[PDB]
């Protein structure tokens, strides 16, 4: 069950190798739009959170 | 212009690093390789300009 707009649902994502492919199970998605990164090197970088 | 200025493009993400003075006049779509992509696609089959 996911939460209203005004009281969007954050949670903090630390101290874990993210696989940025489990995104892509599904596929329907219109809008899998990316600013200021390219999709598709999201695994060669690495984030603090 | 105002919403304009279209002839003007880039490319945001490319198959490979263009080489030193290298030049390329076509815009072919990158492969997503994870699903057979003909036409619009997912993954890594957007429009790069």
């Known amino acids: ?3 209203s707009v005004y ?3 954050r949670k903090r994502i630390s101290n ?5 492919s489990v995104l ?13 990164v390219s ?4 695994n060669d970088l690495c984030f603090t959170n | 212009k105002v919403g304009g200025n279209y002839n003007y493009l880039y490319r945001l993400f490319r198959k490979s690093n263009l ?3 290298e030049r390329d006049i076509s815009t072919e779509i990158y492969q997503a390789g994870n699903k057979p992509c003909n036409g ?5 089959c957007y429009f790069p300009l």
Do not use: I
């Open chain 1, 1 to 3: 069950r996911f939460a």
């Open chain 2, 40 to 44: 619009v696609a997912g993954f890594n």
């Open chain 1, 39 to 42: 999709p598709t090197k999201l």
């Open chain 1, 7 to 9: 009281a969007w649902n």
């Open chain 1, 16 to 20: 874990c190798v993210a696989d940025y």
């Open chain 1, 24 to 36: 892509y199970n599904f596929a329907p998605f219109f809008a899998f739009k990316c600013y200021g």
């Open chain 2, 19 to 21: 080489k030193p003075f």
